[PDB]
Design a protein around this ligand. Structure first.
Ligand SMILES: CC(C)C[C@H](NC(=O)CNP(=O)(O)[C@@H](Cc1ccccc1)NC(=O)OCc1ccccc1)C(=O)O
Ligand SMILES: [Ca+2]
Ligand SMILES: [Ca+2]
Ligand SMILES: [Ca+2]
Ligand SMILES: [Ca+2]
Ligand SMILES: [Zn+2]
Length: 316
């Protein structure tokens, strides 16, 4: 909408107060004009018709329980925009400052979030498996990263290319969580998963097998559920990325860690310059090796560590 840029204040899903960029024109709207061509947050009103209505508020204060998922979807989209711009010199998901759209209060008891080809969408959860999913910065960044992937490598959402698509979203979801630097970890979804159980998460990148996911190519899922295991076999790539950053010895293979920033540079370059829609795990290894070669040189520790990490997870 046309209006003037304003700054509201509210509380997110976990009860934390934050400022949010809004736009005033009769109402205060969840429209942040400070980033690209805007970040826009919508109310889906428990329905499945998208996007719903651009979020409108009478007083620019967002402290109602109903407001909390919108506050966080809006704010964390801004953090993720900042990560891509400041760290990778990428302007929004298309590289040309496309407007970023999110809807919250999607459906009833909806235990998930997604990128539908055009926008981000967040359920409220059923209060047992999840609380509103925009409360997790790694979830929000997972979603915006799907948009980045779709606009760049275009990884098809099945089998190995789809597991790479998933892992890329978990990797950059985690790197954004570290960028914001509030309780960062290598776990996925911990801030919104199972409010009645402490210390768990939906996936682990450091130990995928903790939640049943493979940590070696020899344990990959080969069936048809989950689009050929895209949320399962992502564990193999997530583990490789964790090892590149943090190091470790895994199935007897030692990896010298190179840190999160270099992991992010290598995988961002692989995603945007080398991967294609049908890339498989072996092709991801080659893309990561080449990306590290471009950035650090063929004889570098960074290249050697990429090779060690893929060796450790059985990907040649
Ligand atoms: C369009 C969709 C209806 C279909 C499909 N997306 C999905 O299936 C899930 N959306 P998502 O991948 O963005 C991630 C969001 C997320 C939630 C919590 C923590 C972190 C991220 N959900 C996710 O990881 O859940 C686990 C799981 C889902 C399905 C089967 C098995 C496990 C699509 O993107 O095409
Ligand atoms: Ca209000
Ligand atoms: Ca965390
Ligand atoms: Ca996390
Ligand atoms: Ca929990
Ligand atoms: Zn995903």
């Amino acid at each position: 909408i046309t209006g003037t840029s304003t700054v509201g204040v509210g509380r997110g899903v976990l009860g934390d107060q934050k400022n949010i960029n809004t736009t005033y024109s009769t109402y205060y709207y969840l429209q942040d004009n400070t980033r690209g061509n805007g970040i826009f947050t919508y109310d889906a009103k428990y329905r499945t018709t998208l996007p719903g209505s651009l979020w409108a508020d009478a007083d620019n204060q967002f402290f109602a329980s109903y407001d909390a998922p919108a506050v966080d979807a809006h704010y964390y989209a801004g953090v993720t925009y900042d990560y891509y711009k400041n760290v990778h010199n990428r302007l929004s998901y298309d590289g040309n400052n496309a407007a970023i759209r999110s809807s919250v209060h999607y459906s009833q008891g909806y235990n998930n979030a997604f990128w539908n080809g055009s926008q981000m969408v967040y359920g409220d959860g059923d209060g047992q498996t999840f609380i509103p999913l925009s409360g997790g910065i790694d979830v929000v960044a997972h979603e915006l990263t799907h948009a980045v992937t779709d606009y760049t490598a275009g990884l098809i959402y099945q089998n190995e290319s789809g597991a790479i698509n998933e892992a890329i979203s978990d990797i950059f979801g985690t790197l954004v969580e570290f960028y914001a630097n509030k309780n960062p970890d290598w776990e996925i979804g911990e801030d919104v998963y199972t409010p009645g159980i402490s210390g768990d998460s939906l996936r682990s990148m450091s130990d995928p097998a903790k939640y049943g996911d493979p940590d070696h190519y020899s344990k990959r899922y080969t069936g048809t559920q989950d689009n050929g295991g895209v949320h399962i076999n992502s564990g193999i790539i997530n583990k490789a990325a964790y090892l590149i950053s943090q190091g470790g010895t895994h199935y007897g293979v030692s990896v010298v860690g190179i840190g999160r920033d270099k992991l992010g540079k290598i995988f961002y370059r692989a995603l945007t310059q080398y991967l294609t829609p049908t890339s498989n795990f072996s092709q991801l290894r080659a893309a990561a090796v080449q990306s590290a070669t471009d950035l650090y040189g063929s004889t570098s520790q960074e290249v050697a560590s990429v090779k060690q990490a893929f060796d450790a997870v059985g990907v040649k």
